[PDB]
Design a protein around this ligand. Sequence first.
Ligand SMILES: [Zn+2]
Length: 121
Amino acid sequence: SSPVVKRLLGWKKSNGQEEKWSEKAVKSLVKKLKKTGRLDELEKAITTQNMNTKCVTIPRSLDGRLQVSHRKGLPHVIYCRLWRWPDLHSHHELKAIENCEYAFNLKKDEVCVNPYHYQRV
DNA sequence: GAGTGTCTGCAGACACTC
DNA sequence: GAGTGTCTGCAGACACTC
Ligand SMILES: [Zn+2]
């Protein structure tokens, strides 16, 4: 419904039930980042595929999971699956870059969901 | 431990009224 | 804006399984 949501969805990697879910996951993150001003960095990382962009963080939940329309999962895996690796299955297949300040494995108060701060293992 | 799924009370989001 | 009430998505809480 938002234009940045429509813009970012065009970058999704690859029936109708999942099309609506992926939109929900995007709208969820966009709502969170509009508050922190890191929405511009996310668009820059997605569109330029630049590893040197800033960290795109969301608050860490106690168990690490993020719920989007009844489904639970680790946000970094969710957003790496969405924009980079649609076939991704685990957080073990992901290794954050050294420059990633808020990597998932660091267990900081904020978690980075910048797909270009993670490398497939 | 490691991972997953279901349930539910309430903060945040709307939707009003003066 | 201030105040109030309804609605609803999800974090936190359990409850399992290997
Ligand atoms: Zn990062």
